[PDB]
């Protein structure tokens, strides 16, 4: 029974549920009755003033629905406090790895029922279709699954269990995050999925129960009726100070030399050539269908990774982009990014819950007019 | 008498009483009123050792009833644990399918069967002036979290009946228990008798008069006719001398009416009058009060009619641009019915806000749809697909409308500006050169010649607007750009590239 005490003199979660599809209601009802039969969950009445939404998403290329409880206020008040008590360090050599496997563990973090002293804070609500049948609520008396605080407590179990795996192959570097598992392999693909199979076997036998390819891609420097392209040089002049295009300004007072031209060629040779104080902020720009742009920032001047995403409808492409960018951001700097999207708040809210293949929900703040 | 845990908010002082008698006969009337339920099981006699009570201002506000017990709990509502609402909105009848046997039971002494926890028992203490001291032993009306506690108790009582036979549907809200059975009324009699006996086990009261079989079922202004959810005309009477208790009644009725018939100031009238703890006071009406009276005369003038939802078929929504910023969205399933017709986008914009507004409209349907029917409609929006596909790949902030269809309506939100993929440059015309900034060049361009002019110009206090192309407000520049792009090649204005720096 680890004492879980959050920020002094502050409230908890009070986020209201947003109604969704009727099939989602069926799936969530089935999974909540399953949870009640398992005992990890317990109904509460109106005496509990704390709430959290709950969603139901289809599995990756599978029809098995999965219930996902997503919230940010308890992660904002409790988990960041765990970062002092039982914080998790990030790996430095994980970037150099040839391939990194992302695996979802099954109910491992919700296995220890110890935190009942604050359990009145966690609660998720399943409403009716028409606000007609009374809404049914449930309360966690076990370590919250799908919560960033669960890895902190289950860290001792992971450390005690992973040791034989470490002995078999110490070169693999791991950094668990929420309900994930990021193993790093650098030798070759065959031994990589051999070790993956061994990892699933270890997961099954001891009761503990897509792969991104880092370093295959890096930052993309900029490129370059040619009067408008100079404006692009003004857009990113702060990023790279090499360009000097002051020569072209002359003889321009009215619309109607080898040195300055070489300067653009100099831009061409610029094509060839993290601090936990502040968190990450991601911005995505549309720039035509099939080609999005994502930029991860720590400060406005520093661009930790400039990137562009290329691979229907606008919402699905942006959602998949957000997933990929989050899996990229977790590796390199240790914390989930704070997204910004060029999408209407409620338009995005309509269907983003219907399809998302991740157990981790990133903080985002949509841009809105003042 | 199922126990329920309810506690005061931490570190809060209990209620305090400062009460005065109103009339000499009022004292004895209140004594008789309290003694009747005291010898009944509702309340019990307690000693005066508790120094906390709440002021009482019960009055014979209505002559139809001989006497009533009105106790102020607005002070204790400030000092209580803020519970969590069970559900936000009243069920829209569109969710209720057309049923075969519909009966609306109503419970009268529901607040007199649910007990109250020991914590609040000492707090809800009322005294009759010139006084014997009582504490309120059951769930009290006017208590801030009373609806949620009553709903939870009702669900606890009703769950065995829901689980023993789930063929029928039982919907409970607003202290009334609706049951609609697919079986005939004759077999409904046995099932409803079983339900009444079930509620007899737990001591609740279901008056015989409240049982309804006649087609006009009125529960919250929704006449549940066999096939049309006609809203009964809510009379909403007005009296010259508005008592304050009637003022809170009027505010509650205003919000409950605005839930279906939009009312701007329904909550604002309550905000006008605050701190009026005493339940006996005369409140003159304001001019805005009469404005809201006329407003609810106007909106309630049309009683909505609609055929209930049918699971077999799919919704078909449509938005008609009946005005500039006035779009009527009809959601029909079969032809010739307005299931959830409503006025939308009131004062959304001065002028044509491109197709974005339409997009918003679409969304403002679909979410409402998923709240009322648990589905998503296949929209039948008028304008041709070509406009939305030139607006799909070429728009700045990605936005997705669910679907589209082919319908024709004269007033088209199409703005006819820059529809086709414009050429990068043209044979512009040179010249020496706040929506007036571009307006110079725009009017300099000739609509008959076909040649286009594109020279960027800057002006104070509108630099960001110049780089932009806003259409949210009505400008004569919009008229010029509309009349210029038509019967000519595409016009692509140049933007400041900052060669200087």
Curated annotation (Swiss-Prot), chain A:
Changing residue 179 to E: Strongly decreased RNA-directed and DNA-directed DNA polymerase activities. No effect on RNase H activity. Mg(2+) 1 binds at residues 104, 179-180. Residues 38-212 form the Reverse transcriptase domain. Changing residue 178 to I: 54% loss of polymerase activity according to PubMed:9533880; increases polymerase activity according to PubMed:9657675. No loss of RNase H activity. Changing residue 178 to V: 58% loss of polymerase activity. No loss of RNase H activity. A motif (Tryptophan repeat motif) lies at residues 348-364. Changing residue 356 to L: Decreased RT p66/p51 heterodimerization. Changing residue 211 to A: Complete loss of RNA-dependent DNA polymerase activity. Complete loss of RNA 5'-end and 3'-end cleavages. Changing residue 352 to L: No effect on RT p66/p51 heterodimerization. Changing residue 151 to G: 34% loss of polymerase activity. No loss of RNase H activity. Changing residue 180 to E: Drastically reduced incorporation of phosphorothioate nucleotide. Loss of pyrophosphorolysis (reverse of the polymerase reaction). No effect on RNase H activity. Changing residue 181 to R: 20% loss of DNA-directed DNA polymerase activity. 21% loss of RNA-directed DNA polymerase activity. Changing residue 104 to S: 5- to 12-fold decrease in affinity for dTTP substrates. Strongly decreased RNA-directed DNA polymerase activity. Slightly decreased DNA-directed DNA polymerase activity. No effect on RNase H activity. Changing residue 150 to T: Complete loss of polymerase activity. No loss of RNase H activity. This is p51 RT. The chain holds residues 606 to 1019 of 1447 of the full protein.
């Amino acid at each position: 029974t680890v004492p879980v005490k959050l920020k002094p003199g502050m409230d908890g979660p009070k986020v209201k549920q947003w109604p969704l599809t009727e099939e989602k209601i069926k799936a969530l009802v089935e999974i909540c009755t399953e949870m009640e039969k398992e005992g990890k969950i317990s109904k509460i009445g109106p005496e509990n003033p704390y709430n959290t939404p709950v969603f139901a998403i289809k599995k990756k290329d599978s029809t098995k629905w999965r219930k996902l409880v997503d919230f940010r206020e308890l992660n904002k008040r409790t988990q960041d406090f765990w970062e002092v008590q039982l914080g998790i360090p990030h790996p430095a050599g994980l970037k150099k790895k040839k391939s990194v496997t992302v695996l979802d563990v099954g109910d491992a973090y919700f296995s220890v029922p110890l935190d009942e002293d604050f359990r009145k804070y966690t609660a998720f609500t399943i409403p009716s279709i028409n606000n007609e049948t009374p809404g049914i609520r449930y309360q966690y008396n076990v370590l919250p699954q799908g919560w960033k605080g669960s890895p902190a407590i289950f860290q001792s179990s992971m450390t005690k269990i992973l040791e034989p795996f470490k002995k078999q192959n110490p070169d693999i570097v791991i950094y668990q995050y929420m309900d994930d598992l990021y193993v790093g392999s650098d030798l070759e693909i065959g031994q990589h999925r051999t070790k993956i199979e061994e990892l699933r076997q270890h997961l099954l036998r001891w009761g503990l129960t897509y792969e991104l390819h880092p370093d295959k891609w890096t930052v993309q420097p900029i490129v370059l009726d040619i009067q408008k392209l100079v404006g692009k040089l003004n857009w990113a002049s702060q990023i790279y100070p090499g360009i000097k295009v002051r020569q072209l300004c002359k003889l321009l007072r009215g619309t109607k030399l080898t040195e300055e031209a070489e300067l653009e060629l100099a831009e061409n040779r610029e094509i060839l050539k993290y601090d936990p104080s502040k968190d990450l902020i991601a911005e995505i720009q549309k720039q035509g269908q099939g080609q999005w742009t994502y930029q991860i920032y720590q400060e406005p001047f520093k661009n930790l990774k400039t990137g562009k995403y290329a691979r229907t409808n606008d919402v699905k492409q942006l959602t998949e982009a957000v997933q990929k960018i989050t899996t990229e951001s977790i590796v390199i700097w240790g914390k989930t990014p704070k997204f910004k999207l060029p999408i209407q708040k409620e338009t995005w809210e309509t269907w983003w819950t219907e399809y998302w293949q991740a157990t981790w929900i990133p903080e985002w703040e949509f841009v809105n007019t003042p």
